[PDB]
RNA sequence: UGCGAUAACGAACGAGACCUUAACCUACUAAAUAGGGUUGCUGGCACUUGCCGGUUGACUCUUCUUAGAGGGACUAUCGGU
């Protein structure tokens, strides 16, 4: 957002950049293109006998 | 062990990628349809002259990604591939043409399995699902089996007289092998044995035995008709494929090192198969990804990463 | 200059730390796994990451590395440390004879303990450096 | 003209191979492919190169005008 | 740009990623405002069945066309260094 401001002495040039957060952008991507968030893995118990569970 | 010492006879070279699956027809013996990572699918026919044990008859160019698992119908006129482009293709092997493009999966189709009647196809994909198809192109039953990838799905043949339900087992990356039934249209039994992750679940020609294997380097065999626990082999390295033969109670198993061969009940770890390569350094050596026994129980076919179908043969010592 | 970028490398490392199993050498599979896992917005970037992961795996297959020693690796190490190839015998016993100690050493021993196994050396100071 | 000719040639190369794949032995096709490779003036492989955009400050793509500081 | 060596550790910007376009798709979705195939009528040929045509007469196709959705390359596999 640019906007000139006229005053008695002269002009003042106002510029404003607002970097909106990715999560609240909606249109387009919801995250930055370089960021790679990896999900946390889930634990499992090995072995515990061969076993079966029938129906 | 006794007598037979397997010998590399022929080498088939019509691919430019990993030969990810092979399958000889149930009725017809001469055919060998080989599926690969380079999108093609090649029908070989056994000649049995000099080094050329087989030579290529027809290539089936019709996929936009890998051709993972191929199945042949009972008779040996149609074949169903399972590609990485989220589809299957029902071919006309003799004609050199497609027929049924199967749409529905939201993930690369890893395994396919056709019924013994050549009627009801069933396939599994990296989609947490197993879908059931007809011989046309239509999704009938949809199985919400596992929570992780479903790596293999293979139908077990039956003889003892007609229940109605046909049975298969679904390998997964959830560390759970799971048996099914399709006319209850649902579960048989869960075989929660594996420690690491499963690649292969192969039912035998008998049907009552089912060898499961994967990254663990331990091959867990399962009893299917009795629905009970059975043997567990150690194979050191990661298993890419398994293969039962009609000749005996042989269990062939393609490890990361080579191809190990066991007797099932009398547990002895007998023969290893390893061919030669030009140059190379340490722990790479092109390994067998898939392999297939013929209907004779004579010619062993081995799909390798190095674009060759290597052909081993039975030869008695005495 | 195909130097895979820093961020990508970091991502790869993270992946390795997380999921050493479910990262099989070959590439397409690895890529798929990556896609399943982490929220890569791009495609190219994802591919790059996958490649990096594959490379790392390959490296591992020829022995371990720095900044990549997560869980499984530790276990592998740890076991070896626990059950070392050595030691037969004690070792560092009085295997050959009864200790070739110096005169000074012997004296010290005498001063301290009462009766120890000794073999009193001559103590050649020796010429030059 | 030349380009057109090349295209035609490529098409010709393709066509026979395609036919072989369809309705003839695969061995023959393979042989043909091998032959092409041996005398590869593209033929089966489509030519990779398309022209570069003639970006400003220059009469061609890479070429610039002519500076003078005299 | 990284790897390493390191009173520095982990970070941000810039570069990269990103975007657009240029390349591949006999794999999808499509078309008488894009192109073909058979066939009607129809022009000429040789005159056997065959060759080139012209007509938005019909029927059907999507390779080229476009342009939607996707994949596809990550320096991939192997060799040394
Ligand atoms: Mg190298």
Swiss-Prot record, chain D:
Residues covered by region (Disordered): 50-70
Biased composition (Basic residues): 61-70
Keywords of the record: Ribonucleoprotein, Ribosomal protein
GO annotation, biological process: maturation of SSU-rRNA from tricistronic rRNA transcript (SSU-rRNA, 5.8S rRNA, LSU-rRNA); translation
Gene Ontology MF terms: RNA binding; structural constituent of ribosome
A GO cellular component entry from the record: cytosolic small ribosomal subunit
Family under the similarity heading: Belongs to the universal ribosomal protein uS9 family.
Protein name as catalogued: Small ribosomal subunit protein uS9
């Amino acid at each position: 957002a640019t906007r000139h401001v006229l005053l008695r002495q002269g002009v003042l040039g106002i510029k404003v950049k607002i970097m909106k957060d990715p999560s609240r952008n909606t249109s387009g991507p919801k995250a930055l293109p370089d960021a790679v968030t990896i999900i946390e893995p889930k634990e499992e118990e090995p072995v515990l006998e061969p076993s079966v569970k029938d129906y | 062990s006794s007598n037979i010492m397997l010998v590399l006879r022929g080498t088939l070279e019509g691919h430019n990628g990993w030969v990810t699956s092979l399958s000889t027809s149930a009725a017809q013996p001469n055919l060998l349809v080989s599926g690969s990572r380079d999108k093609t699918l090649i029908s070989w026919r056994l000649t049995e002259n000099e080094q050329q044990f087989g030579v290529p008859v027809r290539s089936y160019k019709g996929h936009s990604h890998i051709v993972q698992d191929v199945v042949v119908s009972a008779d040996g006129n149609y074949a169903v591939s399972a590609s990485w482009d989220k589809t299957l293709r029902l071919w006309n092997l003799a004609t050199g043409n497609s027929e049924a493009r199967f749409v529905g999966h939201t993930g690369d189709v890893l395994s396919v399995a056709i019924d013994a009647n050549s009627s009801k196809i069933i396939s599994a994909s990296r989609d947490k699902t197993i879908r059931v198809w007809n011989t046309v192109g239509d999704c009938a039953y949809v199985l919400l089996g596992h929570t992780d990838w479903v790596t293999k799905v293979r139908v077990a043949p039956k003889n003892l007289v007609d229940d109605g339900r046909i049975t298969f087992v679904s390998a997964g990356m959830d560390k759970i092998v799971r048996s099914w039934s399709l006319n209850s249209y649902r579960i048989e039994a869960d075989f929660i044995g594996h420690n690491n992750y499963i690649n292969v679940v192969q039912p035998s020609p008998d049907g009552s035995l089912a060898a499961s294997a994967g990254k663990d380097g331990q091959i867990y065999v399962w009893n299917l008709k009795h629905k009970s626990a059975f043997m567990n082999f150690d194979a050191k390295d990661e298993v890419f494929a398994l293969a039962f033969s009609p000749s005996r109670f042989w269990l062939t198993a393609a490890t990361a090192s080579g191809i190990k061969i066991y007797d099932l009940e009398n547990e002895v770890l007998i023969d290893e198969l390893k061919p030669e390569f030009a140059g190379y350094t340490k722990a790479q050596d092109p390994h067998a990804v898939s392999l297939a026994w013929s209907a004779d129980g004579q010619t062993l076919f081995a799909g390798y990463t190095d674009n060759v179908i290597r052909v081993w043969q039975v030869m008695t010592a005495n | 200059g195909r130097v895979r970028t820093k961020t990508v490398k970091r991502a790869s490392k993270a992946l390795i730390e997380k999921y050493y199993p479910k990262l099989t050498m070959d590439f397409q599979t690895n890529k798929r796994l990556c896609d399943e896992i982490a929220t890569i917005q791009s495609k190219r970037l994802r591919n790059k990451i996958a490649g990096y992961t594959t490379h790392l795996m390959k490296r591992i297959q020829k022995g371990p590395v720095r900044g990549i020693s997560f869980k499984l690796q530790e276990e592998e190490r740890e076991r070896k440390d626990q059950y070392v190839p050595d030691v037969s015998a004690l070792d560092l016993s009085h295997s050959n004879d009864v200790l070739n100690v110096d005169t000074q050493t012997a004296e010290l021993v005498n001063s301290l303990g009462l009766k120890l196994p000794l073999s009193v050396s001559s103590v050649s100071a020796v010429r030059d450096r | 003209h030349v380009s057109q000719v090349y295209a035609i040639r490529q098409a010709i190369a393709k066509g026979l191979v395609a036919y072989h794949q369809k309705f003839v032995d695969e061995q023959s096709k393979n042989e043909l492919k091998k032959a092409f490779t041996s005398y590869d003036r593209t033929l089966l492989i489509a030519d990779s190169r398309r022209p570069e955009p003639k970006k400003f400050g220059g009469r061609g793509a890479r070429s610039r005008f002519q500076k003078s500081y005299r």
